[PDB]
Amino acid sequence: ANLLTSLVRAHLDSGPSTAKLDYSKFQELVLPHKEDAGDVQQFYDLLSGSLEVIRKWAEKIPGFAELSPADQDLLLESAFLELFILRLAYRSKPGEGKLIFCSGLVLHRLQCARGFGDWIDSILAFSRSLHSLLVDVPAFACLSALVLITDRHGLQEPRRVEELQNRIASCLKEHVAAVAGEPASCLSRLLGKLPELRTLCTQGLQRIFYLKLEDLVPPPPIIDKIFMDTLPF
């Protein structure tokens, strides 16, 4: 209720206003169409732009600043890719091939293809599927917080992370009921996305590995760190 309102405000302050959208660079027609250095740099720049945004968004989740600072960092690092994808999927318009990034920048899928590779198509596929659920903003504000606030290996206080998650899952569950008859299949349908999101996170790690191999442009340090810390080996 007040948790819910707090989650909604954090979500909406973390993205651009429909009026701050920038189509300055949008172009559906590319030419004369393997990645080069400018595609690799833009890929890392787009990823980097979500960094601060997602960190400031997390600090506004009630309870999150009360986790230990080491657990805060671990949760943020481990969830970054997944959050970047989920928020991009929800914000974008896959029917038109339109990617909308957290800064307001709008790009066509073909303008991203070279930097992202196949991953961008799998992100758009997930976006169309997310869209069919017609997830409203409150449900989505809870969902994304649950992507962040979740069990990870190396937490100092995993029970406290679990209680905050229970707190947010109750809030979501209630909200879904308040909006759809009485006295799950919506709910469990929404939660069913979380496993698909983990799989796209992996495609992202694969893409970064590949770009790191090819080495046209090195990843910026913070991205690199996320990449190395999240490798279970």
For 163-230, the DSSP string reads HHHHHHHHHHHHHHHHTS----TTHHHHHTHHHHHHHHHHHHHHHHHHHHHH-SSPPPHHHHHHHHHT
**How far, in Å, CA of 4 to CA of 115, rounded?**
37
Whether 77 and 55 have beta carbons less than 8 Å apart is answered as no
Helices 37-59 and 221-229 pack at an angle, to 10 degrees, of 70
The reported resolution of this PDB entry, expressed in Å, is 2.4
Question: Three-state SS for 105?
Answer: strand
**How far, in Å, CA of 162 to CA of 149, rounded?**
8
**How far, in Å, CA of 120 to CA of 127, rounded?**
10
The number of residues in the chain equals 233
Structure tokens at 98: 């339109």
Angle at the Cα of 1 from the Cα atoms of 127 and 132, rounded to 5 degrees: 20
Contacts made by residues 168-177, CB under 8 angstroms, sequence distance 24+? 168/3, 168/7, 168/142, 169/142, 171/1, 171/3, 171/4, 171/7, 171/142, 172/139, 172/142, 172/143, 172/146, 175/4, 175/138, 175/139, 175/142, 176/139
CATH of 1-233, one of 1.20.810.10, 1.10.10.10, 1.10.565.10, 1.10.3720.10: 1.10.565.10
Backbone angles phi, psi at 100, to 5 degrees: -115, 115
CA nearest to 205, candidates 228, 174, 183, 222: 228
**How far, in Å, CA of 67 to CA of 173, rounded?**
23
Q: Which residues contact 8 (CB under 8 A, 6 or more apart)?
A: 137, 138, 141
Q: Report how far apart, in Å, the C-alpha atoms of 220 and of each of 47, 76, 95, 175 are.
A: 10, 17, 32, 40
Way the structure was solved:
X-ray
**How far, in Å, CA of 122 to CA of 115, rounded?**
14
CB environment 179-190: b (16+ within 10 A), e (fewer): eeeeeeebbeeb
Question: Three-state SS for 144?
Answer: helix
Q: Report how far apart, in Å, the C-alpha atoms of 38 and of each of 23, 79, 190 are.
A: 19, 27, 37
The DSSP H or E segment spanning 99 is strand 98-100
CA nearest to 121, candidates 80, 89, 78: 89
In angstroms, how far is CA 191 from the centroid of its own chain? 15
Q: Which residues contact 39 (CB under 8 A, 6 or more apart)?
A: 114, 115
**How far, in Å, CA of 224 to CA of 152, rounded?**
19
Q: Is 41 exposed, middle or buried (0-12, 13-18, 19+ CB in 10 A)?
A: middle
- The CA radius of gyration of the chain, in Å to the nearest whole number, is 18
Residue 99 bridge partners (DSSP): 107
Dihedral sign for Cα 197, 198, 200, 204, please. positive
